Each structure stands twice: as C-alpha cells, then as structure tokens.
C-alpha cells in the first residue's frame, strides 16, 4: 500500500501535502457525497 | 460439475409445574444484564 | 363407533390432546387436556450467541462492519429459509434471483431531533421499486422472502438517547377516528405503504393503532442506547398465513424506531444526528410470472 | 538449450505440431507439421437428430408446438452452456435468474410481401427493454447467454416461397458508401441496433456488408420452405471473444430472414402472410451489478 | 476482567466493575470461632442472613 491522491485538486499544485489526504467534516445535509474517483490503476490521476 | 459455485435453534421443553428454588450463599457478573 | 377423519384444527403438531368422542369428524370432539409445553427462549432470548460489539456480516455484493453492535436478534428463534414442498401450494417452479436481491439496500436517511416523535417502514413496500429486487417483485404475482434490517445512528460519547427499534407483523394502522372517534375515518394508500421514505407517527404512545408502546417489546426488538451502542440489527423470517403472497397488496410487517429516551445533548456538540436504515431480503422467491405491474 | 516457456498461441488444442527451436519463448518456434483433424459434421450436418415435423419444446412458463417443423439445428452442434470456471475471469457470483428469463419472447410480426426484401435482428439488442431479462441486461454489467430461435409462417398448400433463416456472428453492417464510395459514411445506431421490431436490408444480396448471401448457408441456418415446413428452430451457443461481455455495448450475433425465392400466390387466396419470431434465451447469467443502464 | 463483579451475602449484593480486585486482610478469610480457641462454655447464636 502507498498513498493515493485522491485530494489531487488544481488549487493543491503550489502546497502539494494536501493531495495525501482529503476531509470529512459535520454535515447539515444527509447522505452526501464526500468524494468520487475511478479505480483505473493504470490511469492518470490519483492511482499515478 | 464445470462450476463450484453451484454445488432453527429453539425447541420445545415440557412444564407440568413452576420450576424450583435452590439454595445458596455468600460468594461472573449475573445481576448486570445487557438489555 | 369411534374410528373417524381427521379434520381437526390441532391435528399436525407436535402436542396432542386428549379427547372424548362419538362422530365421524375429529372437530366435534372436546377441547380435552392441554399438554403443557412451552418455549419461553424465543421470544426472551432470541438473541445471537443464544467481543461481540465487533463484527461484520457480507451478503450479496455488500457489506457491513458493526462494531458498536448489541449482539443481533433472530426473530422467534428462526433463520429465513426458502419455502418447502409440504407448504407450497402454487405448481409453477419458483425464480430465486440469489445475489442482484438478497443483498444490501439502503434507503433515506431521517434526522433525529430532540422532538422527534418516531418513525416507520413497511416491508415488502419499502422496496417494490428498489434495483432488481423490486423489478421481480412487479413482475411476479407471488413473493415470499426473509429480512435483515440493520438500523445505524452515531453519537458522541456526551450525547444520550435511547431508540426502540422493533418489528411489528401485520402492522395495521388505524386513524384518531375524527377525534370525537363519531367519524369512521381510514388511512389512505400513502400512510398505510409510505414506500421507501417512511412516515411519521403521530400518536407514538398508541403506536398509531390503540396499542401501549409500552409493551412493543413482546415483538422481536432491539436498543440503540447512544451510551452503549450505534447499530441494531434483527433477522427476521417469512410470516404469513399463506406460502407466499403479493409484495403489493400485502405488508408483511412493519419497521418501528421510536426515541424512547428523547437525544439530548450540550449546546455546541454536533446537532445533526442521523439514523439510517440498511435492509437486505434474505432467501427471497417469487412466482406467477406475468407482465410488470406497480400496483 | 531446448527448455523453454510455455508461451505459444496454439498451446491449448488437442492438435499437437511438431516444430524447432533454440529461443527460450514457445512463440518464436516454426509453424511445424500440420496435423490433419477435421469436424466436417458440425456445418454440414449441425442438426438434431444427428414424425421429426410432430413437436413440442418447453422451457419457463412457455410451450411452442410445431408440426410443420424442419428438425432443429444446433448451432456448431454446441449446447448452451453456463460458463465454467476455467475459462471465467470475473470474481464476482453471478446471479442465474433461470425460469424467469430462460423462456419464450415473442416480438413484433412482419409482413411477408412478394417485393419483400428481408429483415434482421440483433442479439442480445431484441430483448435489453423486454421483461425481467432485459431488466438484468440493465442493471448488469456483464451478460452471457445462449439462443434459441423459433420463425414462424404460415401458408396454404397454394402458396410457395422459401425464406432462409440464419444466424451471423458478429453481424458488423456497412454502408453503400455514398454510392460513388468516396463517402466514408457509418450507420447510425438505430440502423446497428434496430431493437426489437427489426430493420429491412436494402442490399439482401450482398447482405448490407459486402459479401454474399449465397454463401449465408455456411452459418447456422434453415430454410422454410412454404411447401414443406412452417416453421424453423436453431439454438445457439454464446459466441465471444471474451466470457461475458455488455449486453448493450456489444451484439453477438444477428438473425436474418430473407426470402431467397419470392412469395407467390394467386389473386384471391390469403395476402397477408405474416413472418413471427419468438426467441427464448438460454443459460442466462449476469455479473457486475450496478444501478440500470439503458445504453 | 477483575473490575467486573458482583458479591453477594445476606439479601444484599454489590455490583462493582471499576473494581481494583479485592483485599484479604492479612491472608485471611473470616470464620467463626474454633473450639480450641472458644473459652466461654455457653452455646453461641449465629444468626447468619438477618446479621451477615
Ligand atoms: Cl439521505
Ligand atoms: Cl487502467
Ligand atoms: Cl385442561
Ligand atoms: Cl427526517
Ligand atoms: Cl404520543
Ligand atoms: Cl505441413
Ligand atoms: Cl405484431
Ligand atoms: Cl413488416
Ligand atoms: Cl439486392
């Protein structure tokens, strides 16, 4: 296991430590969506 | 056989009579159920 | 003489009666003497284990991980099975989809307000419109299937509140009779199968239907006391007066989960206290094939 | 040296060749000597029974009964089969619906008229809207399945034609290219996968994809000839690359009706004669579930 | 699992879980008097649950 960047956002590029982790924080809505990525290991994006 | 993928706890007691008492003395945590 | 049919109501179990009689029908006897069995650890100690907190159970492609678990409850004592040869009555050979129904489905989410009166589910409605389950159920006429609910709620450990979460076949609802109770009201279609969303009671202490809250626990239940615990979880068999039946026309049974011991919590903590309600059919059949119809 | 890795593409055969080779990878060896095998009955002789008109094949909740049959072909003498665990690749169970899939669908009729130029089908497109199997195709990623295909019509002992009915793997379809063929056009999905109620070839002779009806007969077919039989039957193995594969994104095979010798009659008997296709799927299995998807 | 417990004696018990085990005093568990020990010649009363 290494670390996936999920958190792999165009506004982290400049302080990069923030790609390894992403956030869940007190809802006020249910059921939402905390985050969405594909599992194409081989695919540019947070597998890389 | 080409696949492998295809190949009640209580019961009743008789009771004519209440059940009994029996005897003990000044001695497992019995009294604190988990309800 | 003496040698008759059998045609008496108690004729296949496993309890006999003795009896006192002169014609050719066994219902014309006495009630005679009653044998005197009992099975006082289904309905008391329905429970798992007849560590534990820890858990995690996987059917279909889902899975759940209770941990703060409160051990889980077989209702009555009996495991979903599908149905036998001696009970069946319908000739065409049933459809068990497996895996695309008896699985995890998990439907809307309610909020937990410290006024909150209760909420409730019928079973099969909740799903008659869910993934592949739903489908079989509008195309077929009959269904027959078991359940596993699993009923979720987090708290802090300076939270507190005390939910009910019980089963109730046959829930049959009634109305407050125009108050005066001169007016032979009845509930319509959206109270009686409020499908996937559930609805509300209004009289909780009555269990909108003239019967004591107080004594829901005769029915396979289970606590979700926030201090203890997070999750409930109860098996729950096919029952019925008949082999199998229309998932439209007929609920089952009923869902209850009631806040007993109202949520209280200091100003400040997290306010949004969610329940969610996880349900998975188990050994589900159906037959009477046809084309799909909603209702 | 001479020991090497077992890495050639014809490794898997019960045809053995005897070659030579100084290269630790199998592949880099000679073609070697052909061994002579041959199966010449499953082409020319692929048919049932390797008083045949008198019949009655039941499967589901449906019965055919043909009389004026033609025997029944099977397609590369291959029974449908569920996948074995060999050749699977998929980790998931699948889900095997059975009795309420593997039955008799009857989509729309056809005219048969004496200009008629011939129509086709694909599979499993026909079915991905229709009854609890389209249903699985939606909410499944995966499908597999087999075929049978039963084309029906009818005629008096006074009328004469013969349609050939044919099954076509990959049933890839070309365009008349702008008919000067400087025009590299495509046909629309609705020309590709024309649903259930079929599509019309404009080019029947050079089947819409340039090559030759007369030689459709080295795929599974039969004829109905109007003076001999009625009706046709041909059951299909799943043909595929690959073990299962999308029942959307992908056609396994189209069905063709062409009337080879034109329907003929004379003026006053019956002129509508009518061209119906039911068509049951086989060792239906599903995989990959998911929420529905209808393209 | 020596916090959780729970004695009885008498019509009297004591659940206790955020036990620290518990103390003998000495090494030794209370009993009535022995005869070799006993001097007064008088039979005793030893009224068991209403006093224990
Ligand atoms: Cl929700
Ligand atoms: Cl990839
Ligand atoms: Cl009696
Ligand atoms: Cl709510
Ligand atoms: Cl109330
Ligand atoms: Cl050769
Ligand atoms: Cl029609
Ligand atoms: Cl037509
Ligand atoms: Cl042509």
């Known amino acids: 296991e290494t670390i996936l960047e999920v958190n792999n956002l165009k506004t982290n590029e400049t302080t990069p430590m923030q790609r390894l982790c ?11 969506l905390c985050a969405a990525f594909r599992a194409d290991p ?7 | 056989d080409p696949i492998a993928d295809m190949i009640s706890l209580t019961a009743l007691q008789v009771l004519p009579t209440a059940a009994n008492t029996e005897a003990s003395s000044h001695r497992v945590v019995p009294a604190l159920q988990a309800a | 003489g003496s040698h008759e049919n059998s045609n008496s109501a108690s004729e296949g179990s496993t309890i006999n009666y003795t009896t006192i009689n002169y014609y050719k029908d066994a219902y014309a006897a006495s009630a005679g003497r009653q044998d005197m069995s009992q099975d006082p650890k289904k309905f008391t ?31 009555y004592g009996e495991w979903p099975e599908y149905c036998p040869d001696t009970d069946a009555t319908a000739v065409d050979k049933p459809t068990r989809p497996d895996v695309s129904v ?11 307000a410290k006024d909150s009166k209760g909420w409730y589910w019928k079973f099969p409605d909740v799903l008659t419109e869910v993934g592949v389950f739903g489908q079989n159920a509008q195309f077929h006429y009959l269904y027959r299937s078991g359940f596993c609910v699993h009923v979720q709620c987090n708290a802090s450990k300076f939270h507190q509140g005390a939910l009910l979460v019980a089963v109730l076949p046959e829930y049959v609802l009634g109305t407050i009779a125009g108050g005066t109770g001169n007016e032979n009201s009845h509930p319509p279609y959206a ?11 209004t009289h909780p202490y009555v269990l909108d239907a003239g019967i004591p809250l107080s004594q829901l626990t005769v ?45 209280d919590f200091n100003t400040g903590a997290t306010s949004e206290i969610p329940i969610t309600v996880t349900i998975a059919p188990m050994c589900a059949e159906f037959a009477g094939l046809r084309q799909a119809v909603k209702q």
């Open chain 3, 191 to 201: 109270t009686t199968q409020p499908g996937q969303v559930g609805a509300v009671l």
């Open chain 3, 45 to 75: 100690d329905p429970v798992m284990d007849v560590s534990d907190r820890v858990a995690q159970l996987t059917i279909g492609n889902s899975t759940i991980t209770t941990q703060e678990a409160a051990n889980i409850v077989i209702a």
């Open chain 1, 22 to 32: 992403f956030p869940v924080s007190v809802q006020s809505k249910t059921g939402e």
């Open chain 3, 219 to 263: 029915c396979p239940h289970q606590w979700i006391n926030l201090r203890t615990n997070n999750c409930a979880t109860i098996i729950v068999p096919y029952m019925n007066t008949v082999p199998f039946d229309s998932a439209l026309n007929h609920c089952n049974f009923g869902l209850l989960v009631i806040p007993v011991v109202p949520l």
């Open chain 3, 102 to 112: 008896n699985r995890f489905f998990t439907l809307d989410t309610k909020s937990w």
């Open chain 1, 42 to 48: 081989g695919r540019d994006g947070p597998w890389q």
